[PDB]
């Protein structure tokens, strides 16, 4: 509260405005009182504008810091596990053994989805992108779970949330199986959250599948590292749709579509295919696949970052995890040595150095998932799946906040009142 | 500009911000660069922040004014038709006979949906709410229409717009047919937009259907009166989803759910149940929901509005059409004259005048709909079907602005960094 | 007396008693229980019938539906004037009724159908078909 006294605005008359500060991050000037005084600002993008108060996740992109409930991501990535991290994001505190047991038991008990929903997957085409099917099923949930749609009911929010945490991975693995023609696999209660997901993704009735504890921890880590990322395009969507009263399932569905968004962006789309194919230690290495950048599409391949200035804090543990997985799966990684090739170019190439296309958290998750035999199309599905807990938290905080349903202003510049005189005769 | 001359932001030095003027409405303060210098405004509920600049629709709350590309809603609803209004909202000017016939042809020849998309209907439960099915189906279209998901490819955007505009009526009709267990009706390239919808809604293979001209016109007007409504909640969901780059169908599915949202409260449809549930002057109204109403339970049955001060300009023509409909029908009106008592109560009950709970277009819209035999479980599906052209116009505009992404800032008031230690186990 | 049977015998032996007029020898009983146990699973085409019903339907109504539909699938034992038909039909009913019942239930709650297990008693098998899921092994409380 140093010089945080307060500031003033004026054009023909003056106004008082308080200076609010956060526990971390810069100060903000409250203008919640200017609307009434007849004063409005213009910020197409919400860059200069702060629209909410949160205590979920804290980010300082310049210093490469990411905290979830004060707890640093690196620690959580190595010291906790997805469910405990989930428990932390939604409850604001680490769990006691008892609270945790109860939490994990509630999740584990509702992993199986209604058989009528399963019947939905079968109406989709086999050739469809699993991310698209994922948005389809999740957006269809409200028709089957109409018993917990009222967000103004804390008991509904509770049930809906858990339904999502438990069922997302089940839905995800069904999107995959469906895309490769193998039978759906039921959740198993004796398996951890991650071990159960790998089993639903890979096992068949032909033989017993055994999850490699190493790959299981890696998957668990891929999840923790994608649970939440503070304010962003997809979290804003979840918040915006949420404050309109939209049911939780629909909210999570719009978040999933917002996450997928940049993928089918034409310029990005074209390039991503260029990577997911051109790689015969001829091209990629001799910057052959990198002698073609008319479109950047870098972060979509895991290069550079919007928030973080020099490195993706989440990428520290994923790289070491990445190293561990590769050594575990033995060295029959010919093509997947372009991974080592690209990292070298991202760091040593003057271009990448200058424009800072440094490997982010996805560059390594991508390498881990590939190493596991997971198709490229299932990447964002798994990220959206993990990001779900983060979306619930933001949604819960949004409502359980004050539900200040905002009815935004627009600066109009269209035609002035004019009379209509159709030129058609129908 | 009146008090909109020049303004200076004062901290410990002066920051002169300029005042922007709109062709109609309020002048705003330019603050696009403030954050660009560290200073962030704080405004939840967006009481002062102008979400964007738009040329589509103008609303003057206290003046009960509503314009679409400059034309008064009264003029359009009376001497225009839904398609022509679609053209104007989308193109910015009324069409020539040639532009209209070209636009109409395309709209009619894309009204049939892919057969597989029609299979997905049979996977939902027969007791599913029409609106939840409408959301589920819409949120699943991206899986099929993968050739039109590039939000940046103008050709993709055009196809996506025509696809949504053409098929929405087809799908809304099927949601009704599936709910009551009647076979689905195909589009009729020879019928008009509203007539085709009426045909798909009530025709059966058992006998040919007659499209009453007064009902045909009533419906088209309902479509016109709901074509668009400026920067509201559902549209903010669409603009924000589209900002991330989410595909056309995902954004509209988000809009639908968002438009349905303020109707999930167990007190909502509950009070909206006793309403239509009775056809007896002295049942629904004398001495009943005096307080029997719960959440909104006023504002849900077509009473009042948070944008307009004195009245809803859309109700004018809607109230006129209501008479024409109840008059024309006879059989489906008279025993439904508990409307006049509900309206009378609104125009004289001290409680209603005290809460400005005046009858809005949706009150008169419901009457026309209840008269035509449409169940209240279809009302918002129909309102959404019409609003889609609006969502499409705003989504496009947001794009034209440069795909204005919505990833705002937060005021972090949570835990400062704190070590993480887990003494438990999973 | 019913009190004795309720405490001293078991459903199948009681079934054997109602249809044969006498309590069973070990051999007669073994044969009886083996005949029942061997036909608990129903034709997969009948199972396809359950799925044409609405999920919201009363399980008693679905029960009357499937049982009244059996003659179309088991047209091989409809002539009551044939003692061999009566025999087969009867057993089909004793074995399949519980299977049909648990399918009506599962269908009403959205869980997958559970196949009969031969290692389980008539009642233990019914509880398992009513309650187990593929997610974990179900253990019937004796
Ligand atoms: N935290 C809480 O109190 C929660 C309570 N529920 C309640 O559970 C009931 C079922 O809800 P849904 O899970 O949405 O059912 P749903 O309609 O998807 O149907 C799934 C069925 O399979 C069962 N199931 C799912 N996973 C299972 C597993 N791993 N082991 C054994 N059974 C499993 C479910 O209990 C349900 O019977 C409802 O009453 C719901 O409100 C659901 C989530 C959380
Ligand atoms: N503005 C334009 O030129 C548009 C072109 N298209 C193109 O048309 C094809 C997709 O068309 P969709 O209708 O989305 O196919 P769809 O996947 O929805 O399947 C419907 C099929 O029946 C046809 N059809 C639809 N409505 C009809 C009607 N009322 N009468 C007779 N036939 C009808 C469609 O052309 C298509 O063959 C693609 O090539 C797409 O790019 C789609 C929309 C707009
Ligand atoms: N007491 C007797 O002699 C009886 C003879 N049958 C005969 O058995 C044959 C099949 O009749 P349904 O049972 O009505 O077949 P059905 O048409 O329902 O089809 C069921 C199929 O699954 C088999 N099955 C059922 N439960 C089984 C189990 N627990 N273990 C292994 N296999 C099982 C059946 O044998 C049959 O192959 C026919 O020839 C029928 O006449 C049936 C009942 C009694």
Curated annotation (Swiss-Prot), chains A, B:
One Gene Ontology MF term: citrate (Si)-synthase activity
Activity-regulation annotation: Allosterically inhibited by NADH.
The UniProt record lists the keyword Transferase: yes
Record-listed E.C. numbers: 2.3.3.16
InterPro entries the record matches: Citrate_synth-like_lrg_a-sub, Citrate_synth-like_sm_a-sub, Citrate_synthase, Citrate_synthase_AS, Citrate_synthase_bac-typ, Citrate_synthase_sf, Citrate_synthase_typ-I
Active site residues according to the UniProt entry: 305, 362
UniProt catalytic activity: oxaloacetate + acetyl-CoA + H2O = citrate + CoA + H(+)
One Pfam family from the record: Citrate_synt
Subunit structure: Homohexamer.
Other information: Citrate synthase is found in nearly all cells capable of oxidative metabolism.
Name this protein carries in UniProt: Citrate synthase
Organism (species): Escherichia coli (strain K12)
